[PDB]
């Protein structure tokens, strides 16, 4: 029952490959259907065409801020900054995802992708999806990332949406 949502990933505008999520709807359903209907973009905007603005290697890939491509935009498909909708899942390893914020009850689109258990973050991000197909194009894309987090290419969610 649990949706599965798909990224098709580009390095400076070349194919790199696919990525896909399984979003736990059944444990955080509002933070899955936010990432759910972004990546299918049928609220007339979304994930495709974004990018990943910040990798740190060994720590996580982030995305998702669709409107000002930098880390200072972004917003969910609720009108405002929904709420943390619990912490039962934990940043238990590489392909967790989970929400960026701006502190408690501040989530809009941001997401990241961990690649290392990031038990640091329990309790403060919203854990709602894990990657199901496409870890290795992840272990791809997080070799462009730096030590501050600027990307040596340009990351791009070239396409995306909902599979089965």
């Given at each position: 029952v649990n949706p599965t949502v798909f990224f098709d990933?580009?390095?400076?505008?070349?194919?790199?490959?696919?990525?896909?999520?399984?979003?736990?709807?059944?444990?955080?359903?509002?933070?899955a259907e936010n990432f759910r209907a972004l990546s299918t973009g049928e609220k007339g905007f979304?994930?495709?065409?974004?990018?990943?603005h910040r990798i740190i290697p060994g720590?996580?890939?982030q995305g998702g801020d669709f409107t000002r491509h930098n880390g200072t935009g972004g917003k969910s498909i609720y009108?405002?900054?929904?709420?943390?909708e619990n912490?039962?899942?934990?940043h238990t390893g590489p392909?967790?995802?989970?929400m960026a914020n701006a502190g408690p009850n501040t989530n809009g689109s941001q997401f990241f992708i961990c690649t290392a258990k990031?038990?640091?973050?329990?309790?403060?991000h919203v854990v709602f999806g894990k990657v199901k197909e496409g870890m290795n194009i992840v272990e791809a894309m997080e070799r462009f990332g730096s030590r501050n987090g600027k990307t040596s290419k340009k990351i791009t969610i070239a396409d995306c949406g909902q599979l089965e």
């Open positions: 990933i580009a390095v400076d505008g070349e194919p790199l490959g696919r990525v896909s999520f399984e979003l736990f709807a059944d444990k955080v359903p509002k933070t979304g994930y495709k065409g974004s990018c990943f720590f996580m890939c009108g405002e900054k929904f709420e943390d912490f039962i899942l934990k392909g967790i995802l989970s990031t038990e640091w973050l329990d309790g403060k």
